[PDB]
Design an enzyme around this catalytic site. Structure first.
Site, PDB file in Angstrom:
ATOM      1  N   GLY A  48      26.385 111.534  35.924  1.00  0.00           N
ATOM      2  CA  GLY A  48      25.043 111.080  36.235  1.00  0.00           C
ATOM      3  C   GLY A  48      24.075 111.632  35.220  1.00  0.00           C
ATOM      4  N   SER A  49      24.233 111.231  33.960  1.00  0.00           N
ATOM      5  CA  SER A  49      23.675 111.977  32.842  1.00  0.00           C
ATOM      6  C   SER A  49      22.500 111.293  32.142  1.00  0.00           C
ATOM      7  CB  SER A  49      24.788 112.239  31.826  1.00  0.00           C
ATOM      8  OG  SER A  49      25.210 111.001  31.250  1.00  0.00           O
ATOM      9  N   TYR A  53      17.247 115.034  36.230  1.00  0.00           N
ATOM     10  CA  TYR A  53      17.988 116.284  36.103  1.00  0.00           C
ATOM     11  C   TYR A  53      19.296 116.094  35.330  1.00  0.00           C
ATOM     12  CZ  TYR A  53      14.654 118.488  39.261  1.00  0.00           C
ATOM     13  OH  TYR A  53      13.498 119.052  39.777  1.00  0.00           O
ATOM     14  N   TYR A 235      13.977 115.312  54.587  1.00  0.00           N
ATOM     15  CA  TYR A 235      14.889 116.095  53.740  1.00  0.00           C
ATOM     16  C   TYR A 235      15.580 117.250  54.453  1.00  0.00           C
ATOM     17  CZ  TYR A 235      13.005 113.693  49.621  1.00  0.00           C
ATOM     18  OH  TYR A 235      12.584 112.759  48.700  1.00  0.00           O
TER      19      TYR A 235
END
Length: 400
Positions: A48-49, A53, A235
């Site tokens: 997930g680059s 983040y 959350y």
């Protein structure tokens, strides 16, 4: 062609290729200015680059630690007639600059939840790097196609039990409003754990051990978020809270496994940041504008790059080699500055007093919208937006 911004609300259907490359350039320059991370890993996988983040994770590792990097993502290349996704140019710009520096950089483009994603990664590691000593799990997809069945599951940002009503900023009127969100169903909660929990994280780690491509001492980290009490009903107590629960369970299981040869698994709880999905929950732009203003005043404001740099150099790979400070659940906490009392107390006190009229005075809201535009490559500094631009931009990436 010439690239406009087509943006109403917080949907922007357009990206600027050079603005995106300029954003990777700034984040790279920021990391290099902090200096090499002496104890940093050398062969790093980022699942997930391509943005947020995950991109900063790949940038820290390569340009702060000198690592070879493989990154996985699902982006859309640009054609001659249609610009691609920000994540495509983000990745392409990473590859350019890493190769300019002699750092290994390969990228795989497709469904990171699929069994084929693990196989093409195992194979690609075996052609050069041989083994990996850090896995960053930084996928941020609201959707998971189950690897065995093809069923498509999506998560839901809903409270559990009761309705969630909070103050928020209405889109493109910048008017203070009251937003509501209905409780999740029994099936929406399961589905959120399925998409946003640690199952696919464990699939990556377990499959990579079973190919031998995990180096002894390998560490892995997944990214999470706890947020302010303004968003506890989503959350913490809501559907996404059960997902983060599940990420904790996975981190415990993964930490036991890799502990055999000295490695670790941690959840890293990161701070509030402006991302392409951050404007989903209606209160988040309002809160982010407000707390960014205070954190700027107190000099503790950070973006995604600074967060991951601090996680690397002040948690996982410290100069002195001392262990990372963790919380009671063995989580790294990089939201420690944002959740300081004087910062949170400021928001608490200002929150009832925010109006459409004082919005731009009590909060950095006009800056919020600029930063959001910066995600897609607009408003950036080193860019003439009247220049013609080719949206076709290639790099060292293979599909699937």
């Amino acid at each position: 062609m010439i690239i406009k911004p087509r943006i109403r609300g917080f949907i922007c259907t357009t990206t600027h290729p050079v603005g995106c490359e300029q954003n990777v350039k700034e984040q790279i320059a920021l990391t290099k200015a902090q200096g090499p991370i002496a104890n940093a890993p050398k062969r790093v996988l980022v699942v997930g680059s391509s943005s947020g983040y995950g991109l900063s994770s790949r940038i820290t590792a390569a340009f702060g630690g000198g690592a070879s990097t493989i990154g996985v993502f699902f982006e859309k290349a640009g054609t001659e007639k249609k610009p691609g996704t920000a994540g495509w140019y983000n990745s392409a710009a990473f590859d350019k600059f890493a190769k300019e520096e002699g750092l290994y950089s390969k990228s795989l483009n497709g469904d990171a939840f699929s069994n084929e994603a693990k196989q093409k990664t195992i194979d690609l590691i075996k052609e050069d790097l041989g083994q990996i000593d850090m896995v960053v799990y930084s996928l941020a997809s609201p959707v998971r196609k189950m690897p065995e069945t093809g069923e498509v599951i999506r998560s839901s940002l809903k409270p559990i039990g009761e309705t969630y009503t909070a103050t928020a900023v209405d889109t493109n009127k910048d008017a203070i409003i009251e937003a509501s969100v209905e409780p999740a169903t029994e099936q929406e909660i399961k589905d959120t754990v399925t998409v946003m929990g640690g199952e696919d994280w464990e699939l990556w780690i377990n499959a990579l051990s079973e190919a031998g491509v995990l180096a002894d001492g390998c560490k892995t980290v997944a990214y999470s978020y706890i947020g302010t009490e303004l968003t506890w009903p989503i959350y913490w107590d809501g559907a996404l809270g059960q997902a983060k629960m599940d990420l904790d369970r996975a981190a415990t299981a993964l930490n036991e496994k890799l502990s055999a040869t000295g490695g670790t698994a941690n959840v890293a709880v990161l701070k509030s940041v402006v991302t392409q999905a951050s404007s989903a929950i209606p209160v988040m732009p309002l809160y982010i504008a407000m707390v960014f203003k205070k954190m700027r005043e107190e000099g503790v404001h950070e973006g995604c790059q600074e967060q991951i740099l601090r996680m690397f150099s002040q948690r996982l790979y410290k100069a002195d080699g001392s262990a990372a400070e963790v919380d009671e659940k063995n989580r790294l906490r990089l939201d420690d500055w944002e959740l300081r009392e004087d910062i949170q107390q400021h928001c608490r006190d200002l929150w009832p007093q925010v109006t459409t009229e004082n919005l731009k005075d009590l909060t950095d809201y006009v800056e919020y919208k600029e930063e959001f535009l910066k995600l897609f490559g607009f408003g950036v500094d080193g860019v003439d937006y009247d220049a013609d631009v080719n949206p076709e931009v290639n790099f060292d990436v293979a599909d699937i």
